[PDB]
Design a protein around this ligand. Structure first.
Ligand SMILES: Cc1cc2nc3c(=O)[nH]c(=O)nc-3n(C[C@H](O)[C@H](O)[C@H](O)COP(=O)(O)OP(=O)(O)OC[C@H]3O[C@@H](n4cnc5c(N)ncnc54)[C@H](O)[C@@H]3O)c2cc1C
Ligand SMILES: NC(=O)c1ccc[n+]([C@@H]2O[C@H](COP(=O)([O-])OP(=O)(O)OC[C@H]3O[C@@H](n4cnc5c(N)ncnc54)[C@H](O)[C@@H]3O)[C@@H](O)[C@H]2O)c1
Length: 295
């Protein structure tokens, strides 16, 4: 049923880049690109919440061929043009500084991807993943907690739920539940897909709530910069109330370490009603309603 490993690294699908467009607006920090690939000529199918592998060219410092890196699929199963012909990724160029070994260091696969030109051939594997799947139930509530390119699987959910062309293509999934995205980025220019997220909220104000945590522009009640964990604490009681519904699913995606502050906030909320969140959470994970994908 769920497609998985239609292509493997020993014999990857050779897709072609259609487009590579910037998602960070001027005045933003770093580079994050929306890259769409042509899947025609192969049989790669996928669903929302999954990832694919990309194998970059070249060898590592020991002369060994580079291995795949996994990237969350940014598009629904139908692709951005709703034609079942493409797949998209949302890729941040990894950059960081050493203890002054050279200067700035640039990630191999992400630099390759963010600078890739239309027409180029790319080695793709997958899809992979069954832990970030969206429920078929159109009355489900969906909480989405995303930092940075943790937005990526959330885009697949929200596009499937709310894009006109998706609704026309998916007669079986006409979303009427409530979805709430809490999205943490450093600046307004860094709000990936800002325009479309805000278009969705304006069209569906009773079915989609959009909350930002913008660290360089906002401060929490303690005076520190605003992070997603702060917004979760701010809305902890409300989020807990929603989580108690048997049909509510929560999705967490982004940097490993974002989970700690989220659990602390929800633990304080749940404790007010005599519930130990860590235990309730274990039951949710077992039931397939607590979805985490961080690294
Ligand atoms: C399931 C999954 C989904 C993912 N989805 C996405 C996605 O949608 N978008 C996206 O942009 N990324 C995503 N990632 C991350 C992605 O897989 C790559 O790891 C990332 O793009 C960097 O790879 P790279 O080849 O550019 O860097 P590499 O050449 O592989 O370099 C990475 C290495 O650099 C070092 N390093 C990294 N940061 C620092 C630091 N600050 N200080 C010192 N050393 C450091 C570490 O040793 C690390 O192993 C995902 C990862 C997983 C596991
Ligand atoms: O510097 P900074 O602190 O602003 O960077 P950050 O806090 O946004 O962390 C970036 C890291 O988070 C992880 N990440 C981001 N999106 C992901 C996703 N879609 N799936 C899995 N892991 C993901 C990656 O390992 C990435 O290198």
């Amino acid at each position: 049923d769920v497609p998985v490993n239609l292509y493997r690294p020993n014999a990857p699908f050779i897709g072609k880049v259609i487009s590579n467009e910037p998602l960070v607006k001027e005045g933003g920090i770093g580079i994050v690109q929306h890259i769409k690939f042509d899947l025609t000529g192969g049989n790669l199918k996928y669903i929302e919440g999954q990832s694919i592998g990309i194998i970059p060219p070249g060898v590592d410092k020991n002369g060994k061929p580079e291995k795949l890196r996994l990237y969350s699929i940014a598009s629904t199963r139908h692709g951005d043009d709703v034609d079942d012909k493409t797949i998209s990724l949302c890729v941040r160029q990894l950059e960081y500084k050493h203890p002054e070994s050279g200067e700035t260091v640039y990630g191999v696969c992400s630099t390759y991807l963010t600078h890739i030109e239309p027409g180029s051939e790319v080695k793709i594997t997958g899809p992979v993943g069954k832990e970030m799947l969206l429920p078929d139930d159109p009355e489900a509530n969906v909480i989405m907690l995303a930092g940075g390119t943790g937005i990526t699987p959330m885009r697949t959910y929200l596009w499937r739920m709310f894009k006109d062309a998706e609704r026309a293509a998916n007669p079986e999934y006409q979303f009427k539940g409530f979805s709430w995205l809490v999205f943490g980025v450093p600046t307004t220019p860094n709000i990936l897909y800002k325009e479309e997220l805000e278009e969705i909220q304006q069209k569906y104000p009773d079915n989609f709530r959009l909350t930002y945590a913008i660290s360089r522009e906002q401060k929490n009640p303690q005076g520190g910069r605003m992070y997603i964990q702060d917004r979760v604490a701010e809305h902890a009681d409300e989020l807990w109330q929603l989580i108690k519904n048997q049909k509510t699913h929560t999705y967490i995606c982004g940097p490993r370490g974002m989970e700690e502050g989220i659990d602390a906030a929800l633990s304080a909320a749940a404790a007010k009603e005599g519930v130990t969140w860590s235990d309730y959470q274990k039951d949710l994970k077992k039931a397939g309603r607590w979805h985490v994908e961080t690294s």
